[PDB]
Amino acid sequence: NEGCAPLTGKESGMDIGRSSTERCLPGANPLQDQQWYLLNSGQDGFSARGGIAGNDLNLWWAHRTGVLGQGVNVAVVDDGLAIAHPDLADNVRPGSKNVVTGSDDPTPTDPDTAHGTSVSGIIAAVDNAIGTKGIAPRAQLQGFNLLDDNSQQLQKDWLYALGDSNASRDNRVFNQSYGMSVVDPRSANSLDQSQLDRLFEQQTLKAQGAAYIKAAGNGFNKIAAGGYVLNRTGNGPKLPFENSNLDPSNSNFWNLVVSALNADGVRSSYSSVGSNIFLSATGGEYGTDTPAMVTTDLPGCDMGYNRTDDPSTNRLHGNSQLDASCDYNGVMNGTASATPSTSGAMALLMSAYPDLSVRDLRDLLARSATRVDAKHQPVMVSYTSSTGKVRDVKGLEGWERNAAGMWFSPTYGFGLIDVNKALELAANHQPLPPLVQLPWQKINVTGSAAAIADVGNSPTSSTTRIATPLTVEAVQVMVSLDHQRLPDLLIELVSPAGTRSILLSPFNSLVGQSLDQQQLGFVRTKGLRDMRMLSNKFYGESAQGTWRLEVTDVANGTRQVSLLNRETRERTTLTERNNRQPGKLISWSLRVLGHDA
């Protein structure tokens, strides 16, 4: 709004909050008042209804004081980027690569390949008199179309896009609005993953360090994999199908993993969740019945999510009054929208305080985040043990406060991004000391204590001592075990302070043992083999003392999973048969990442 004047940034008694009398956005972008993620006034985003005011990135004070992402280079590693879009072009810097054609132009040829362009607009749509306003409208973009339908997702291309090349090395934000859904557990130790983890480490920890931002996934209810869609049928507990620790990349620490929030201020229906979520950011729903993300589309009414042959109930689409060339859409969503929301927030902070490290920025975002949905309840799992003890155990936490006073939930991480408050804290921030990565401590488990009984009376437990005084930032765990029905397992970690974190919630999507039995007649997966998980729950706590891993089999009932063949439309039922034998914990390893206070 042109009536929203700049602030000096020094106004005495300024309310920087989500309900401030001073809450407005400068700018003449005609669609910016429908970008609820910038400022949520209960507007509908061209969908059938609006949400609840205040549920946004709380970035209005950044915008009113000229904090706009200037000098910050962002890489969008995605399906493409229409670099000639009128509301993006001014912010495109040299170095994009089309990994399919080899050109410097990652513009898609496929009308539905609008994802990367939509992502890009959330970050950095140009501040002008057309379209939308980016979160960080002075940030500079490159695009690398790794997710183009004709990209084989080659290692050389991942390296090129994610900081290894001359072109991409000087980005300070790497936006990764993508992930891998799995039905069988993976080790994180493969050479391809090790190589990228090493790159991300080097890129994060250098001068002018780069922040990797990563989508948690959209698998609360359903996952898609290799032309099939899977979801649980029945009336099981409301635990995520995709826990965000299932994709091995999401536990690498260098990735800041984000869940999605809707315009009502609660977890977007589809969002994956887990102990490795760092923050919640804006992703919306679908833009049909309720708000999604108004952003830049592939240009023209022949390309993109806003195109003549792909109608939407979103009112912005095919609308000659509001968007005659169909250059914008109102349906962008997902953790793929939470990711650029966070990339943009990061770019704002970096532009305001260019000397701060990635770990400093994480600290500021965590300590300033809003505790949305404060009363949401833990999700309990009920079963009867072999001794007839009826148990009710926590399968997913609500909000909990750790021993260092940090509020955390697996749904929202440290909470919803509050850019204004992060900037308030940044003005007085003192730099964190260097990152210390403690050596992995491996615990091989033997004898009777290794057993994981069906429907256990208590967890199978294993403990190790960390001797080093360290303030925790994150913990990584690798687990190896045998068990015939993996989703029966609840895996939890306990710190020396007694703080608990569920690393893997049960009834997740690791149904591959059942799928293998049905499809093949034999089972490839014996259990977990160095499966990696991360928790943020312990941020700020002392590492010194005993850490305990707990694993429990919490189900003996049958479960069914619906399998959809996307091509044929054939629906199959997969039955998960209870494990006939007890499982066995083989080993686990603990890595503490933190600093010396």
Partner 1 sequence: STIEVNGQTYLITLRRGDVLMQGAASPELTVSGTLLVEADDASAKALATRHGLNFKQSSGGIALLEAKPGTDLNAIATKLKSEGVNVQIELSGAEQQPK
44 binds, among Ca ion, partner 1, none (CB under 5 to 8 A by kind): none
Rounded CA gap, 461 and 211, in Å? 35
Residue 534: name the closest of 569, 498, 504, 489 by CA. 504
Window contacting Ca ion (CB under 5 A); options: 103-111, 175-183, 297-305, 472-480: 297-305
On whether the CB atoms of residues 105 and 85 are closer than 8 A, the answer is no
306 binds, among partner 1, Ca ion, none (CB under 5 to 8 A by kind): Ca ion
- The bridge status of strand 73-77 relative to strand 173-176 is parallel
Nearest approach, Cβ of residue 191 and partner 1 (Å): 4
Nearest approach, Cβ of residue 241 and partner 1 (Å): 13
Taking the least distance from each CB to Ca ion, the nearer of 307 and 362 is: 307
Rounded CA gap, 177 and 255, in Å? 11
Please provide residue 75's backbone torsions phi and psi, each rounded to the nearest 5 degrees: -95, 130
Rounded CA gap, 221 and 232, in Å? 7
Q: In this chain, which of 56, 360, 454, 576 binds Ca ion, going by CB under 5 A?
A: 454
Q: In this chain, which of 225, 322, 436, 443 binds partner 1, going by CB under 8 A?
A: 225
Span 496-515, contacts to partner 1 by CB under 8 A? 512, 515
Nearest approach, Cβ of residue 144 and partner 1 (Å): 12
Residue 499: name the closest of 437, 438, 547 by CA. 547
Q: Quick one: 242 exposed, middle or buried, by C-beta within 10 A (0-12, 13-18, 19+)?
A: buried
DSSP codes, 539-551:
TT-B--EEEEEEE
Please provide residue 382's backbone torsions phi and psi, each rounded to the nearest 5 degrees: -105, 135
Nearest approach, Cβ of residue 315 and partner 1 (Å): 25
DSSP codes, 536-583:
-TTTT-B--EEEEEEEEE---S-EEEEEEETTT--EEEEEEPPPSS-E
Taking the least distance from each CB to Ca ion, the nearer of 53 and 523 is: 523
Is 131 a binding residue for Ca ion by CB under 5 A? The answer is yes
The interface mask with Ca ion, positions 2-41, x = CB under 5 A, is: ---------------------------x------------
In angstroms, what CA-CA distances link 149 with 75, 103, 152, 219, 300? 19, 16, 8, 21, 21
Nearest approach, Cβ of residue 593 and partner 1 (Å): 18
Is 304 a binding residue for Ca ion by CB under 5 A? The answer is yes
Window contacting partner 1 (CB under 8 A); options: 46-54, 130-138, 212-220, 348-356: 212-220
Is 339 a binding residue for partner 1 by CB under 8 A? The answer is yes
Q: In this chain, which of 553, 587, 589, 594 binds Ca ion, going by CB under 5 A?
A: 553
Nearest approach, Cβ of residue 339 and partner 1 (Å): 7
Span 24-83, contacts to partner 1 by CB under 8 A? 78-79
Sign of the C-alpha dihedral computed for residues 404, 407, 409 and 415 taken in this order:
negative
488 binds, among partner 1, Ca ion, none (CB under 5 to 8 A by kind): Ca ion
Query: With b meaning 16 or more CB within 10 Å and e meaning fewer, what string describes 191-225?
Result: eebeebbebbeebbeeebbbbbbbbbbbbbebbee
In angstroms, what CA-CA distances link 490 with 381, 499, 504, 555, 583? 10, 16, 6, 10, 13
On whether the CB atoms of residues 250 and 214 are closer than 8 A, the answer is yes
Is 407 a binding residue for partner 1 by CB under 8 A? The answer is no
Q: In this chain, which of 16, 82, 123, 199 binds partner 1, going by CB under 8 A?
A: 199
Binding residues for partner 1, per CB under 8 A? 78-79, 115, 146-147, 149, 152-156, 159, 164, 177-181, 183-184, 190-192, 194-195, 198-199, 202, 215-218, 224-228, 230, 334-336, 339, 512, 515-516, 519-520, 524, 563
Binding residues for Ca ion, per CB under 5 A? 29, 87, 125-126, 128, 130-131, 297-298, 304, 306-307, 326, 454, 488, 553, 556, 578-579
